[PDB]
Paper text:
In this study, we describe the first in class rationally-designed triple activity inhibitor that concomitantly disrupts functions of three critical targets based upon known synthetic lethality relationships in cancer cells—[name]/6, [name], and [name]. SRX3177 showed nanomolar potency against [name]α, both bromodomains of [name] (BD1 and BD2), and [name]/6. To gain insight into the molecular basis for inhibition of [name], we assessed binding of SRX3177 to BD1 and BD2 of [name] using NMR and X-ray crystallographic approaches. In conclusion, in this study we report the first triple action single-molecule inhibitor SRX3177, which disrupts cancer cell signaling through simultaneously inhibiting [name]/6, [name], and [name].
In the complex, SRX3177 occupies a large hydrophobic pocket located at one of the open ends of the BD1 four-helix bundle. The base of the SRX3177-binding pocket is lined with a well-defined water shell, which is conserved in other [name] BD1 complexes. Particularly, a hallmark contact, which is required for functional bromodomains, involves formation of the hydrogen bond between the acetyllysine substrate and the side chain of Asn140. In the BD1-SRX3177 complex, the side chain of Asn140 is hydrogen bonded to the thienopyrano group of SRX3177. Large chemical shift perturbations in 1H,15N heteronuclear single quantum coherence (HSQC) spectra of 15N-labeled [name] BD1 and BD2 were observed upon gradual addition of SRX3177, demonstrating that SRX3177 directly targets both bromodomains of [name]. A slow-to-intermediate exchange regime on the NMR chemical shift time scale indicated a tight interaction, in full agreement with the nanomolar values of Kd and IC50. Treatment of Huh7 and Jeko-1 cells with SRX3177 abrogated binding of [name] to the MYC TSS, indicating that SRX3177 has pharmacodynamic activity against its [name] target in cell-based models.
Residue numbers in the entry: 43 to 173
Amino acid sequence: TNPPPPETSNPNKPKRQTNQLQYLLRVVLKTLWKHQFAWPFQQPVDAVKLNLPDYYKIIKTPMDMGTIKKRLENNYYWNAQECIQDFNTMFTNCYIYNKPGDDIVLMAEALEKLFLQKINELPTEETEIMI
Ligand SMILES: CN(C)C(=O)c1cc2cnc(Nc3ccc(-c4csc5c(=O)cc(N6CCOCC6)oc45)cc3)nc2n1C1CCCC1
């Protein structure tokens, strides 16, 4: 009833490390992880614990910062854009499922606003770093 967590490691997959991806782990996610509103996003949503029957009917691609952190540590992404998409998927799922003004929505918007501030300091070019 609770689907398995999303994939965090996969053999024979396009994988590498870039200066932008390192910045996503060492600076961006590091700042968002220690936010006061971060804990509801540090692990996948437990739909049966929170009594959300129609969650996985609406949300087709669940995503959370715990999964993103593991994917960054395991070098699961091919470039930075693949990781930023996972953040935007996480935010959008909360916007899709919940009414505007709800508590969990306000917390997600605060994280996204901070996320976009830390993203503006990303290096201009994406250069490949050895693993
Ligand atoms: C004032 N209260 C009740 C609190 O301080 C409080 C005590 C809590 C105990 N456990 C949790 N766990 C929790 C863990 C994950 C989520 C979550 C992540 S995405 C997402 C989402 O999209 C929708 C929901 N909902 C379930 C509750 O509200 C209706 C919509 O929850 C989530 C929500 C809650 N939150 C707790 N909270 C807050 C309320 C919800 C988030 C934090």
